[PDB]
Design a protein around this nucleic acid. Sequence first.
RNA 1: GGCCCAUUCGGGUCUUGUAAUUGGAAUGAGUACAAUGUAAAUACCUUAACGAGGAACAAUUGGAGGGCAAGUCUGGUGCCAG
Lengths: 46, 14, 49, 87, 368, 103, 360, 283, 14
Amino acid sequence: FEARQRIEEKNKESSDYHAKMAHIVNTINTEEGAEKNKYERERKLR
Amino acid sequence: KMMKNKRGGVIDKR
Amino acid sequence: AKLVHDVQKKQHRERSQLTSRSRYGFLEKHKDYVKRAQDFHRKQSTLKV
Amino acid sequence: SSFEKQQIEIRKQIEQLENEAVAEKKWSLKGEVKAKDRPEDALLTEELEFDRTAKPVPVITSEVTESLEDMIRRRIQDSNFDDLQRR
Amino acid sequence: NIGKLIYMDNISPEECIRRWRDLEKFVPYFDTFEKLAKKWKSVDAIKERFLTWYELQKAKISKQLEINNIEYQEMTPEQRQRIEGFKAGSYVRIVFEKVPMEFVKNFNPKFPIVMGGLLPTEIKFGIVKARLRRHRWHKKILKTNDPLVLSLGWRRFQTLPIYTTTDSRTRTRMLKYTPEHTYCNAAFYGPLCSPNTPFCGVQIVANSDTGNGFRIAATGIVEEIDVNIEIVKKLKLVGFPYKIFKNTAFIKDMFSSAMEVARFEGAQIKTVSGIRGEIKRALSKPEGHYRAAFEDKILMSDIVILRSWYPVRVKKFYNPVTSLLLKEKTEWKGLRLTGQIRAAMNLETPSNPDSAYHKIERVERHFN
Amino acid sequence: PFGGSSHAKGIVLEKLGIESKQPNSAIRKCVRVQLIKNGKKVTAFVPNDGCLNFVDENDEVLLAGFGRKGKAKGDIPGVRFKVVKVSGVSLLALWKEKKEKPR
Amino acid sequence: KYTTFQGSQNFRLRIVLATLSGKPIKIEKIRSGDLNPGLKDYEVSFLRLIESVTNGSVIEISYTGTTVIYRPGIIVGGASTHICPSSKPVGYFVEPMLYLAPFSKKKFSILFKGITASHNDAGIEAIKWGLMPVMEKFGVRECALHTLKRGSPPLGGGEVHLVVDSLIAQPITMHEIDRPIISSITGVAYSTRVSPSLVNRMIDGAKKVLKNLQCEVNITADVWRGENSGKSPGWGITLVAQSKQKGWSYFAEDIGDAGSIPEELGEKVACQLLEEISKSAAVGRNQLPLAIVYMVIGKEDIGRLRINKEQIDERFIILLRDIKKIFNTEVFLKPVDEADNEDMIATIKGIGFTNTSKKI
Amino acid sequence: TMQRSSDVNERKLHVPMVDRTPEDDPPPFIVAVVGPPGTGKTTLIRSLVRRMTKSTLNDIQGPITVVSGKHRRLTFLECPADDLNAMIDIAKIADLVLLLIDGNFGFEMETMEFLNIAQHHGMPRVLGVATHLDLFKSQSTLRASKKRLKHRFWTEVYQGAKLFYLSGVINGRYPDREILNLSRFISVMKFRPLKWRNEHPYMLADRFTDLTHPELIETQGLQIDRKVAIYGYLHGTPLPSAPGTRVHIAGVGDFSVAQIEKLPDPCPTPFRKRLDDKDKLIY
Amino acid sequence: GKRAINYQILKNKG
RNA sequence: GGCCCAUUCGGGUCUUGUAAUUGGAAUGAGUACAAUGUAAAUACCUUAACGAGGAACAAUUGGAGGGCAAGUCUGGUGCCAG
Ligand SMILES: Nc1nc2c(ncn2[C@@H]2O[C@H](COP(=O)(O)OP(=O)(O)OP(=O)(O)O)[C@@H](O)[C@H]2O)c(=O)[nH]1
Ligand SMILES: [Mg+2]
């Protein structure tokens, strides 16, 4: 019984953590690389 | 699992 | 080593066989096991051929 | 004095945990505990946790047997089952 | 009138309202519906109720400060006693009752008498979780469950910390020393300050043992406070094979009974070669012997390992220094370090003989 | 990048990626900082996980541009700046213990 | 050691302010001269909720049940669930959690399970539309009461997911030296396990009372169909008046029972709301407790909030006496300098509160 | 010059925090003289108070608060040089630190330990004072050790702190030219608000008594936990006036206040202009 | 009784 | 055995290495007799005595690349990849 419970709670914890880390990675990618490319675009005009 | 990281408890003397 | 200290990339030393369990000489570690296993696998591969 | 008996009970616990610190370990804090380095069957009374390879075989209960039971009730009621067909 | 009536606390609250002219019930008191109907048949009573960044933050805080002053400009015993009270630069006498005898007896005016006001948090005790660091000029490494004197807020107090690590953020498991040149976590039973406050820590505060080295040993900040910590110390259970086949083996002594193996069935073990495995069933007649299955054929010169975790407790030990209650006011002595205790009662330091490293030389590996 | 300056001073909000299970990952050595000039919140690196425990919160950081010389492997492209000081003390000097961080 | 109170009045506020201040209290004579003397089951389960929310707090009920000892501890939060008794709805237990809610280690994600509404307690719409905006402008920004299902009395069976997820340091200092102009007046008429025409009857009664004021009236309508309706028939109505330029709100609710006309209940809640507008100034008579509690646990500055003459009562000043009894602070009522009405401006200097449970 | 203007205008920006120090009657700034045992201190505190208040204050003890400006007054106290405990306390509450360095011997671990304890508990302003400039005939080595001490001091405090050089003692105390422009350096220091100090009500005690009852001591016999009055100026946030406020007296334990009677200022600052020698007071 | 500084605090080659 | 070239296979070349031992010479920073200089003193100039083996009398800064554990983490088509 403790086997089944421990295994499934560890699987749930890992699947939550991977979603959370992937979320913060591509939110830092999208909503700050847009500003990086905007600065590069308005620096290419100079 | 509810007991695991508790430190208080009500003391019902009734 | 760009931002690593030399006191950080030290040398971890490896452990020996227990002296009580010493008649079975040389506690083997992962490099010894892979030298064992890939030898077994190439000989089984040519036996299967 | 008041600070005197505070100081002597402080010195009491000073002494008891300084010779805890000098004195011999618990077996359970030390790693590489063999069979011969433990109290004999201190492990049933231990409440120790660890990890396992695979999810063990499911114990069939009344709720899971009625789960697949009313599942196949629904299935064979609407006759949405899958067989072979003749050629 | 109304504030004096509210805070004059020997008269009933309805008497305050009476001589001016219960919260389990959430919704407030309304009239009867008929009285309210004849009262609010009209509507016209309430028809007029119906219808740079750094300098910006500084402007907001100076706006709050001028609001503070122009709303302090009020009644004199209200401001200067009870609504804020004794701002700064006020010269006060302050009386403490039940001060120890030893202070008044050994009061030497060279040593300063500082006092500081504790917050609601700093009167609570419990486990403080810090991240600390051996100070870069302190020579010797620090050891868990050796006392060190912390300077945490106003208090200086000798405590027993235990240095932990969250090994790739999975556990918070227990080290045996602090690291050489970086930060670890730590946890000590002491008075709970707020988080993000910094502290120093000292091995030795006296002068008879002041030596020649640097005396401040640890630096750090406080990460978190709690009433309990759940930290662990790894214990492995080692057992040896005695009957090996292909892909399975019979493992001898990590358990003393088939009840113990039954308790531990299905657990994943591994040899020291990293060959993963699983324990399957306790053998019947030799008691702690069991049958395990491995990735492939293990050898007779291996050791299997069951990595488990044992919980460890912080030691609820706390003595404040009270250096001003001594006749010397240096030479304060608390709990000693473990090397000092061993040097005192002449016990040799514990040496596991098969824990010492050697110079392993590989034989050449040839197969048939 | 910052406007007309080369560096910019900022306020540390919170260490992003503090729950990342990989030491010295680019997600882990990655700090969110409010610049003090225009108030906006940007994201900055730090040299390693080892110097990640010199910043905690509202630390008066100083940050420059990053300058990637080639497409890295474990990168997150879309973080532009790197932390170069903390509370007026160079954290490379802090990392090699040449100075002590004052508070 | 213990600050001593007497009687079983303001029980939740006493335990809440003891948890905020960190001071050990005793409450003595819990209805001792009574036929069944002592603590009741709903306040005992409130003590169990306090033990769920905090950690390291020791509560010590006596033999006779007529005195309780609360030695508080660190607010830690976590995810929980609370199966509160039938004697009180979920509002009786989610109202005192809104004080402790933004000051914990881990964010509040609790779901309460029981009766949704009561005549003499807070509802879901009451908690949400009235009591969340005053926290929303006292400093929190992410707070939500979700209904997953709702249960009218007596059988109930409704679950309510309280989730706050902004863990602030301390609430900001309030500065409301005005009477906020009411921009709109909206509401929600709900009904479970009855016919959908009762909601429109309630809405029509409330709006025919409200029709003579020259503002805009909008009442939303929800019938609850299915398993989300709960185990009992019920219906009720909650109106709010909405100042949109600042965000303020003034609410009034009730519920119908066995033999109640829905147009009667709609016009009753409408007139009760208009009387709350009359007797209100920048708060409500029921939003006023946690408003001045957040003003007293703000920073160590002066925060000032306008109130009117009729909001002073025995409940309000027994609140002020309990505040001064626990952490020794006074309110200063200064009157405004214009005389078409009687409004004080209560200035409270907040104690130096921070939440010290949130890890840095 | 526009890039210069941007990069200089940038380093005016700092973290906007509250102040919590009043502007009407601020407390006397706590000046702590910190040295290893055998250099300056006494002679230095005596010389500074003699220059400041025209009063030969032989045989000092305790904190000494004098008026040194039209609105800046300040408190002089000296740590006992062997005690790390008193070193730690005055590190936690001092505002200005006169850091005594035996320039002939060099740097020392007591001043290094104070510098690190202060750096971790909220580094105050530090003016370093190097004495014992009687090295040899070699003015060359005087200048060499002068530069080396300045650079090593600059790695511990901000780069551009003030190291001050005192010459030999002449007639019991230091040269008054050097102490005059040392007080000129103390008079302009422009203190910046710290954090622990400006969320905590603290106080350094310049007067102490026990207001116990001597015939009660005759009754019970000297074992009595006896009551104590503690007089002094208080700094930081406003300490509340109700009895029962908890207080740590740093070195004897934790107490709660019983009664506070605030007193008129014993060393007040008086209401281009100069400071009258009548108004250069001393408490 | 003069606790002199040493080389690693003096030269600071961290 | 070192080194060099080259995408590859490979090719070209040659007294080259070593925390190996060891030997007596050299002096400079420093410590310092002086005299000179100068109203006087500093400094420059001249100059006896001592002053090196980790010559520890202890120069940095930045870059490139590894390698290790009965260690830890992640993924998944065993022993692998990261
Ligand atoms: N030559 C010389 N002697 C000094 C100087 N400053 C202080 N002293 C001597 O230092 C001696 C020791 O006394 P103090 O200087 O008062 O000692 P302290 O610095 O207060 O330190 P403690 O002895 O620990 O109190 C005095 O008798 C002075 O002659 C200085 O600049 N030059
Ligand atoms: Mg002295």
